[PDB]
């Protein structure tokens, strides 16, 4: 298991523009296009991202390319972030993926707001962090996903993803 497989399971893959759980225009493997309620804005963002006239549809290779860009961006983003980098550096490999997962979903800003959970993770207080992590909108809005990521931080294993 690795971060790509992990996110591929959490985000799914759709080749046509679609609305994510928040009702935002998205495509491929969780690639957010825009927060605007406008589909044209979405299609425009799509063409710009891909570099051609897509009319709201992309190929699997195009999806995978965006995905490669998005994961790189997330890691790079974490590494650049004063609040996140130290946590990331403190973690083992599997748990690093769980952190990447959150940043991919909520953005570096959002995750950086989990101050308390972050301190806990840094301190390696797995159970306590897991409880804190669950007291969030994130958990209440996307519980199955949150549970998987949380279980990952708690255990340091892929068990939450094995069998999916
Ligand atoms: Cl809550
Ligand atoms: Cl969910």
CA-wise closest residue to 83 among 107, 115, 106: 115
Which class for 115: exposed (0-12), middle (13-18), buried (19 or more C-beta within 10 A)? exposed
Candidates 3.30.930.10, 1.10.530.40, 3.40.50.300, 3.90.79.10; correct CATH number of 1-164?
1.10.530.40
Could you tell me the residue ranges of all domains in the chain? 1-164
Q: How far apart are CA 156 and CA 131, in angstroms?
A: 16
Residue 33 marked in a binding site: no
DSSP secondary structure letter of residue 30: T
Strand order in the sheet with 14-19: 14-19, 25-28, 31-34
Q: How far apart are CA 91 and CA 45, in angstroms?
A: 35
Q: How far apart are CA 26 and CA 17, in angstroms?
A: 6
- Quick check: 137 and 105 in contact, CB under 8 A? no
Q: What's the distance, Cα to Cα, between the start and end of the chain in Å?
A: 11
All residues at 6 or more sequence positions from 92 whose CB lies less than 8 Å from its CB, including other chains:
156
Number of helices (H) and strands (E), helices first, in the chain?
Answer: 9, 3
Q: How far is the CA of 148 from the centre of ligand 1 (A)?
A: 17
**Token pair of 141, please?**
């809005």
CA-wise closest residue to 19 among 6, 3, 33: 33
- Quick check: 101 and 149 in contact, CB under 8 A? yes
Q: How far apart are CA 54 and CA 63, in angstroms?
A: 12
Pairing of strands 25-28, 31-34: antiparallel
- Nearest ligand to the CA of 146 is 2
Dihedral sign computed on CA atoms, order 30, 34, 35, 40: negative
The position carrying tokens 């806990």 is 120
Residues labelled catalytic: 11, 20
Method of determination? X-ray
Q: How far is the CA of 136 from the centre of ligand 1 (A)?
A: 4
**Token pair of 132, please?**
């804190």
Q: How far is the CA of 23 from the centre of ligand 1 (A)?
A: 22
């Amino acid at each position: 298991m690795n971060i790509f497989e992990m996110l591929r399971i959490d985000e799914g893959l759709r080749l046509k523009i679609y609305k994510d759980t928040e009702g935002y225009y998205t495509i491929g493997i969780g690639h957010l296009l825009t927060k605007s309620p406008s589909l044209n804005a979405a299609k425009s963002e799509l063409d710009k991202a891909i570099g051609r006239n897509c009319n709201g549809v992309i190929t699997k290779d195009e999806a995978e390319k965006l995905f490669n860009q998005d994961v790189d961006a997330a890691v790079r983003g974490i590494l650049r972030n004063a609040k996140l980098a130290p946590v990331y550096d403190s973690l083992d490999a599997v748990r690093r993926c769980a952190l990447i997962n959150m940043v991919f979903q909520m953005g570096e800003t959002g995750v950086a707001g989990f101050t308390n959970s972050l301190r806990m993770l840094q301190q390696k207080r797995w159970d306590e962090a897991a409880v804190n992590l669950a007291k969030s909108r994130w958990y209440n809005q996307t519980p199955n996903r949150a549970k998987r990521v949380i279980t990952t931080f708690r255990t340091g294993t892929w068990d939450a993803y094995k069998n999916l």
